[PDB]
A = this chain, B = another copy of it.
Amino acid sequence: MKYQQLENLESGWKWAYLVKKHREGEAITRHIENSAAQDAVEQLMKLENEPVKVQEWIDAHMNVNLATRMKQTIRARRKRHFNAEHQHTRKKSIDLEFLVWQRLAVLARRRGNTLSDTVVQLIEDAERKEKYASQMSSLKQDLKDILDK
């Protein structure tokens, strides 16, 4: 584990997640009978501030089908929680026009690197384009002198 896993903080996240899924209309419970599940949900609503308890609840009453998905969601939020501390470890979200993203994705795939890294290469290559043009004509002139001389 690269990031530290704070039991207190994540249990709260898992709680909010399980609660959010419910008001969204999903099966947080593993129980099929609407009685044992209907209750498991009611109890869970109490665990709001009891971390240790939330972990237990999950073990007995949560739908096995949410197990991996939640592991993803919480895993990702953990990362994001700590990357938020310094700006160089943060990510920025932007939208690009379809066609523009397409040209950029193709580039990156072909070069074999990340979208970000590709953008950095583009910025550095595109900046030296001027120092390269003048490098062509300067080279093209010096040669024309080697001939008539």
Contacts and interface: CB of A to CB of B under 8 A. Distances in A.
Interface of A: 23-24, 87-104, 107, 115-117, 119-123, 125-126, 128-130, 132-133, 135-136, 139-140, 142-144, 146-147
Copies of this chain present in the complex amount to 4
A98 B93 contact: no
B123 A96 contact: no
Contact of A136 (B98, B119, B135): B135
Contacts of A135: 132, 136
B88 A98 contact: yes
B122 A100 contact: no
A83 to B, nearest CB: 9
Nearest to A87: B98
Contacts of A93: 93-95
A100 B95 CA distance: 15
Given A120-B103, A139-B147, A143-B147, A92 B92 contact: no
A122 B126 CA distance: 6
B130 A104 contact: no
Nearest to A115: B94
